[PDB]
Structure 1
Amino acid sequence: IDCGHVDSLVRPCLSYVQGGPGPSGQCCDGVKNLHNQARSQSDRQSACNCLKGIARGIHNLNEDNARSIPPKCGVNLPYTISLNIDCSRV
């Protein structure tokens, strides 16, 4: 998992994190799917790198929405479009 499919999976959730209407009916199904499939540390560490490289370029990144993605639908992710996680022991 060299951050190739995970990107498009969390990409739909960014639409909300930016501070606009979203995320999308794909953010919950899309991210819950990857999350569910992520049964190894590898899939948790790889995915974290995806959002990290991305979020790093978001100047007006919003934590309120980024953190409101999982509690909304009920995906519960151990990381979002923010730099407040380790993804080491998740």
Structure 2
Amino acid sequence: IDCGHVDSLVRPCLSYVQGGPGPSGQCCDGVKNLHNQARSQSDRQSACNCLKGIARGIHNLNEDNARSIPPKCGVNLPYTISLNIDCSRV
């Protein structure tokens, strides 16, 4: 998606990405939605840029904690996250 509904849906996740319990079920719905939105090639580019703008901007943040989000609610992503991994320009 054009770096927008993703931006909205990550917010409930940010609590945990930054440092917290959960995240909430809303984020889990957000997770399957991110996986579903991030599928066309454009989408990977837009989501990746959204990320390189948002969380990279919020440097005080814990990507490796976020790693645990998918193996918890029960879902996976085409790639994890471009803070300590890569933009995944598929």
Q: TM-score range by the shorter chain?
A: 0.7 to 0.9
- Contact 1:13 1:27 (8 Å CA) reproduced: yes
Cα deviation digits, residues 20-53 of structure 1 (max 9, x gap): 2231111111121231243311112211222221
Deviation of the 1:78 alpha carbon: 3.8
Residues 42 and 35 (structure 1), Cα distance of their counterparts in 2 relative to 1, 3 Å cut: same
Residues 8 and 18 (structure 1), Cα distance of their counterparts in 2 relative to 1, 3 Å cut: same
What secondary structure does 2:19 align onto? coil
Structure 1 segments unaligned to the other structure (5+ residues): none
- Contact 1:17 1:63 (8 Å CA) reproduced: yes
Cα deviation digits, residues 30-89 of structure 1 (max 9, x gap): 121231243311112211222221112223211232111111112212455651233435
What secondary structure does 2:3 align onto? coil
Equivalent residue pairs, number:
90
**Percent of residue pairs identical:** 100
Structure 2 segments unaligned to the other structure (5+ residues): none
Aligned-pair Cα RMSD in Å = 2.2
Residues 77 and 69 (structure 1), Cα distance of their counterparts in 2 relative to 1, 3 Å cut: same
TM-score, with structure 2 as normaliser = 0.76
